[PDB]
Every structure is written in structure tokens, then in C-alpha cells.
Amino acid sequence: QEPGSGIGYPYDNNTLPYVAPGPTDSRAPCPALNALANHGYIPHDGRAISRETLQNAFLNHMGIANSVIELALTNAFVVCEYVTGSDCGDSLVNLTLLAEPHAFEHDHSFSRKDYKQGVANSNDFIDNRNFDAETFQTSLDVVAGKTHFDYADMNEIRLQRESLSNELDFPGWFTESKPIQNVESGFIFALVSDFNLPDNDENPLVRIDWWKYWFTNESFPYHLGWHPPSPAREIEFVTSASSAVLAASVTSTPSSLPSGAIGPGAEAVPLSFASTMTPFLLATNAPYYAQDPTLGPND
Ligand code: HEM
Ligand SMILES: *[C@@H]1O[C@H](CO)[C@@H](O[C@@H]2O[C@H](CO)[C@@H](O[C@@H]3O[C@H](CO)[C@@H](O)[C@H](O)[C@@H]3O)[C@H](O)[C@H]2NC(C)=O)[C@H](O)[C@H]1NC(C)=O
Ligand SMILES: *[C@@H]1O[C@H](CO)[C@@H](O[C@@H]2O[C@H](CO)[C@@H](O)[C@H](O)[C@H]2NC(C)=O)[C@H](O)[C@H]1NC(C)=O
Ligand SMILES: *[C@H]1O[C@H](CO)[C@@H](O)[C@H](O)[C@@H]1O[C@H]1O[C@H](CO)[C@@H](O)[C@H](O)[C@@H]1O
Ligand SMILES: *[C@@H]1O[C@H](CO)[C@@H](O)[C@H](O)[C@H]1NC(C)=O
Ligand SMILES: *[C@H]1O[C@H](CO)[C@@H](O)[C@H](O)[C@@H]1O
Ligand SMILES: *[C@H]1O[C@H](CO)[C@@H](O)[C@H](O)[C@@H]1O
Ligand SMILES: *[C@H]1O[C@H](CO)[C@@H](O)[C@H](O)[C@@H]1O
Ligand SMILES: *[C@H]1O[C@H](CO)[C@@H](O)[C@H](O)[C@@H]1O
Ligand SMILES: *[C@H]1O[C@H](CO)[C@@H](O)[C@H](O)[C@@H]1O
Ligand SMILES: *[C@H]1O[C@H](CO)[C@@H](O)[C@H](O)[C@@H]1O
Ligand SMILES: *[C@H]1O[C@H](CO)[C@@H](O)[C@H](O)[C@@H]1O
Ligand SMILES: *[C@H]1O[C@H](CO)[C@@H](O)[C@H](O)[C@@H]1O
Ligand SMILES: *[C@H]1O[C@H](CO)[C@@H](O)[C@H](O)[C@@H]1O
Ligand SMILES: [Br-]
Numbered sequence: 001q002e003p004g005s006g007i008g009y010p011y012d013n014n015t016l017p018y019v020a021p022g023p024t025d026s027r028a029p030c031p032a033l034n035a036l037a038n039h040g041y042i043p044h045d046g047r048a049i050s051r052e053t054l055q056n057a058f059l060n061h062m063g064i065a066n067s068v069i070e071l072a073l074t075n076a077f078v079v080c081e082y083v084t085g086s087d088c089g090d091s092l093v094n095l096t097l098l099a100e101p102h103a104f105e106h107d108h109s110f111s112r113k114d115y116k117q118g119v120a121n122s123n124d125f126i127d128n129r130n131f132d133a134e135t136f137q138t139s140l141d142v143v144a145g146k147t148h149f150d151y152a153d154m155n156e157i158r159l160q161r162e163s164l165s166n167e168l169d170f171p172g173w174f175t176e177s178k179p180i181q182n183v184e185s186g187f188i189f190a191l192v193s194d195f196n197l198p199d200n201d202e203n204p205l206v207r208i209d210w211w212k213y214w215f216t217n218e219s220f221p222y223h224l225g226w227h228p229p230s231p232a233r234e235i236e237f238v239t240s241a242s243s244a245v246l247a248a249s250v251t252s253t254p255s256s257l258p259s260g261a262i263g264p265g266a267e268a269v270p271l272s273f274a275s276t277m278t279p280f281l282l283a284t285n286a287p288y289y290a291q292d293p294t295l296g297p298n299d
């Protein structure tokens with residue numbers, strides 16, 4: 001928000017306004033990076049981004065500690081080198097390259113389509129990067145009529161997304177990615193679980209309105225009473241939440257799940273790509289921004 005607004009106070013004492021991305025700005029497949037860029041906490045153009053820029057932006061503006069993004073930073077820079085063909089040093093070339101498929105970006109996202117979702121021909125690909133309202137509605141439908149949801153509900157949401165994606169993706173494309181997705185499941189609990197409930201750390205419940213505002217608007221739900229978690233969330237919370245999601249008993253089983261979907265997931269580790277492997281072409285779509293309604297500087 002505008003710095004003088006005080007909307008972030010006393011959790012964020014140095015806010016900057018929301019500014020929609022323009023057609024030449026680079027955006028990510030990540031709702032967090034996109035919100036940061038929209039506020040200029042990382043470059044508004046989404047280009048030339050250092051590790052420390054990311055660390056400070058997450059810590060000071062989202063209540064997300066450095067530990068939470070240590071592996072994400074490693075993976076971002078691995079993917080930058082893979083996509084561009086050269087070491088990116090400590091200047092991430094842009095955010096858009098993070099949507100390189102079957103890499104850091106993965107299938108069965110909560111709010112993005114898959115790279116070969118619903119394509120008629122094998123060489124086709126689509127926008128697997130920008131927020132997609134219909135896809136996100138398939139996630140939200142699992143918790144329809146509710147204000148909050150728990151680990152078991154999140155497990156059901158990701159299973160629904162895996163089912164749909166395995167059915168809809170071009171044959172042979174779908175590749176399950178429980179380790180990365182469920183770090184992201186943990187990120188959702190870390191950012192938008194309801195810290196106003198007494199037992200949030202033992203038993204976090206996502207506020208659906210906060211989640212929907214963050215994802216749809218790629219800005220922060222201050223108007224709904226959200227603020228950055230304080231103290232900042234640490235990695236322990238995120239991987240515990242990830243494990244709890246996958247450990248939760250499944251009471252409704254969609255059809256068409258890949259083998260081993262129900263059960264624990266592997267620990268996330270650094271990505272690596274063969275030097276001979278050429279990257280898949282990135283989707284070239286202009287960055288998404290919310291239009292129904294458009295957002296003002298304080299939204
Ligand atoms: C350097 C830091 C980060 C990098 C490089 C990064 C990168 C990415 C990438 C590549 C994806 C796409 C995965 C896919 O859905 O196919 C993604 C998704 C996601 N990210 Fe980030 N991320 C970072 C930090 C965070 C943090 C700290 C949060 C929240 C606390 C966050 C929340 C999410 C969520 C919830 C998704 C899933 C979106 C969906 O499934 O629709 N990310 N991120
Ligand atoms: C974010 O950075 C990535 C990585 O640099 C950009 O993707 C790459 O964009 C370049 C154009 O600047 C593409 O190069 C072109 O490739 C075609 C086919 O190989 C070639 O015939 C052209 O002469 C040109 O070299 C490159 O393909 C593309 N990389 C991938 C994997 O798709 C991306 O455009 C940047 N996005 C933003 C919004 O800044
Ligand atoms: C996206 O952000 C807009 C702007 O903040 C949201 O619309 C406003 O919501 C706030 C509460 O968050 C209300 O006080 C305003 O009356 C709303 N204004 C307008 C112009 O509608 C919108 O709800 C957000 N989208 C989602 C899905 O959360
Ligand atoms: C991205 O741009 C490519 C051309 O550079 C197209 O071949 C791709 O289909 C893709 O097009 C989409 O996004 C561009 C902006 O980059 C729009 O101009 C297109 O209409 C389309 O939405
Ligand atoms: C915001 O400023 C107030 C008033 O000085 C201070 O008490 C509080 O600790 C500050 N918050 C942060 C995150 O520094
Ligand atoms: C989440 O999982 C990690 C291991 O991946 C632990 O280090 C952490 O304490 C939490 O259990
Ligand atoms: C790891 O931490 C999470 C988040 O605090 C808990 O919900 C979980 O039960 C485990 O203790
Ligand atoms: C990972 O951690 C979660 C949260 O403690 C457990 O529920 C799960 O069984 C696994 O150990
Ligand atoms: C069985 O229970 C889980 C959560 O406990 C739900 O998410 C599911 O919809 C079914 O009711
Ligand atoms: C229980 O929930 C699962 C996952 O959302 C559905 O696929 C199933 O049809 C039932 O509603
Ligand atoms: C749906 O079905 C699967 C196996 O058929 C179970 O693992 C799950 O708990 C749910 O009953
Ligand atoms: C979230 O984190 C847990 C614990 O490391 C994994 O088991 C899961 O697959 C996901 O990466
Ligand atoms: C990471 O691992 C891959 C193997 O999958 C190698 O190709 C790469 O060079 C790096 O060692
Ligand atoms: C977002 O931008 C639109 C332009 O379409 C305005 O009409 C709206 O009031 C908001 O500022
Ligand atoms: Br660029």
C-alpha cells in the first residue's frame with residue numbers, strides 16, 4: 001500500500017503500492033513472487049533479481065523467513081542456467097523463466113493450467129504460468145461453502161487437481177510432483193492460515209478469503225485483516241505442514257490418480273538438468289493482472 005496509509009503497520013512499516021504489471025513486464029507462475037513484483041519489493045519489471053532482494057522482500061513484506069526460501073533460491077538459479085544456457089550468477093534473468101515446465105514449475109497446480117493441458121496435438125503447449133480463474137475454481141470447489149480448511153482438506157484439493165490434470169493433459173505429459181506441490185501446500189498454510197485462532201501453530205486453518213484474494217489479485221489481503229505472520233514463518237513450519245497434508249486420511253478418492261498419489265511424499269531436493277537437454281519453449285503470454293475489479297494502489 002501507499003507508505004503513508006499505515007495499512008501494514010505495525011507488521012510492515014515500509015509498504016509500497018500495488019502497480020499492475022504492464023505488457024512487457026516479466027511475471028512468474030508464483031503468486032508470491034508476483035505480488036512482491038507488483039509492489040516493487042522485487043523489481044516491478046520482474047528482471048535481474050538477486051538472492052538478497054528476494055530474501056529481504058519475503059522477510060520484510062510477507063513474514064517469510066530466509067530459511068523458507070533457501071531451496072527455492074537454489075532451484076530458481078538452477079532453472080535460470082538450464083533455460084538460458086549460462087550461469088545466472090546472482091541476477092535471476094527474469095521471473096517468466098520459472099515457468100519452464102517439468103522443472104520447478106510442475107503439473108497439477110492449484111491455479112494454473114498444465115503446459116499440455118487439453119491440447120489437441122502433441123507439439124502444442126499453452127499458458128502454464130498466469131493465474132487461471134477456472135483452474136483455481138476447481139481447487140476452491142473442493143472446499144465450497146466453507147470459510148476455513150485444514151490439512152485433510154488440502155490433501156483432498158491436491159488429489160482433485162492431480163486427477164483432473166492426469167485426465168486432461170495430453171497423453172504422456174502428466175508428471176506427478178508431490179514434493180514441490182506440497183512445499184507449496186505448506187506455503188499456503190504458512191502465509192494465509194488464520195493466526196487469529198488460538199491454536200494456529202499446532203493446527204493451522206487456511207482462511208479461504210485470504211487465499212482467494214492473494215491468488216486472484218496477486219496482492220495482499222490487508223483489507224480482510226491479513227498481515228505478515230509475526231514472527232516470520234520458518235522452514236520447519238512449512239515442511240511439517242507439507243508432511244501433515246500428505247499424512248491426512250483420504251475420505252474421498254478421485255479416479256485417475258497416478259500410482260502412489262495417496263501416501264507420504266519425498267523430501268524436496270535441488271533440481272538438476274542434463275547439460276545436453278534443451279529447455280521447453282516458455283509460454284509468451286503477457287502478465288496477468290486482476291480486472292474484475294482492477295486494483296488500486298492500496299489493494
Ligand atoms: C525464491 C522464492 C520462490 C520461488 C523461486 C518460487 C517459485 C515458484 C514456482 C516456479 C512455482 C510454480 C509451481 C507450479 O505451480 O507449477 C510456484 C508456485 C507457488 N508458489 Fe512460489 N516460489 C518462491 C517462494 C514462494 C513463497 C515464499 C510462497 C508463499 C509463502 C510461495 C507460494 C507459492 C504457491 C502457493 C504456489 C502454487 C501455485 C499453484 O499451484 O497454483 N512461493 N512458486
Ligand atoms: C525471460 O527470459 C527467458 C530466457 O531468456 C526468455 O525466453 C527466451 O526468449 C528468447 C527471446 O529473447 C527466445 O529466443 C529465441 O528463440 C528462438 C527459438 O529458439 C530463436 O529462433 C530466436 O532467434 C530467439 O533466439 C528463447 O526461445 C526463449 N527461451 C525459452 C526457453 O523459451 C523470455 O522471453 C523472458 N521473458 C520475459 C517476459 O522477459
Ligand atoms: C481483489 O481485490 C479487490 C480490491 O481490494 C477486492 O474488492 C474489494 O474487497 C474489499 C475487501 O477485501 C472490499 O472492502 C471492497 O468493497 C471491494 N472492492 C471492490 C472494488 O469490489 C476483491 O474482493 C479481491 N478479490 C478477491 C477474489 O479476493
Ligand atoms: C506469446 O507470444 C508469441 C509471439 O511472440 C505467440 O506466438 C504465442 O502464441 C503467445 O501469444 C500470446 O501472447 C502474446 C503476447 O506475448 C499475444 O500477443 C497473443 O495474442 C497471445 O495472447
Ligand atoms: C513498526 O513501527 C513501530 C513503531 O515504532 C514499532 O513498534 C514496530 O516494531 C515496527 N515494526 C517492525 C516490523 O519493525
Ligand atoms: C519438515 O521436514 C523437514 C525435512 O524435510 C524437517 O527438517 C522439518 O523439521 C520438518 O519436519
Ligand atoms: C509440524 O508443524 C506444523 C505447523 O506448526 C504442525 O501443524 C504439525 O503438527 C507439526 O507439529
Ligand atoms: C511428516 O510430518 C507430519 C507432521 O508432523 C506427520 O504428520 C507425518 O506423519 C510425517 O512425519
Ligand atoms: C472426508 O473428510 C475430509 C476431511 O476430513 C474431507 O476433505 C473430504 O471431503 C471428506 O469429507
Ligand atoms: C470427495 O472429494 C474428492 C476430492 O475432492 C472428489 O474427487 C470426490 O468426487 C468426492 O467429492
Ligand atoms: C478413497 O479410496 C482410496 C483407495 O480406494 C483410499 O485410499 C482412500 O482413503 C479413500 O477411501
Ligand atoms: C513437503 O515437505 C514434506 C517434508 O519434507 C515432504 O514429505 C513432501 O513431499 C513435500 O515436499
Ligand atoms: C544434476 O544432476 C543431473 C542428473 O540428473 C546432471 O545431469 C547434472 O549435471 C547435475 O549433476
Ligand atoms: C482499476 O483500473 C480500472 C480501469 O479499467 C478502473 O476503472 C478501476 O476503477 C481501477 O482503478
Ligand atoms: Br528478460
Ligand SMILES: [Br-]
Nearest residue numbers: 117118119168
Ligand atoms: Br482442458
Ligand SMILES: [Br-]
Nearest residue numbers: 178179265266
Ligand atoms: Br513423492
Ligand SMILES: [Mn+2]
Nearest residue numbers: 105106107109
Ligand atoms: Mn504448474
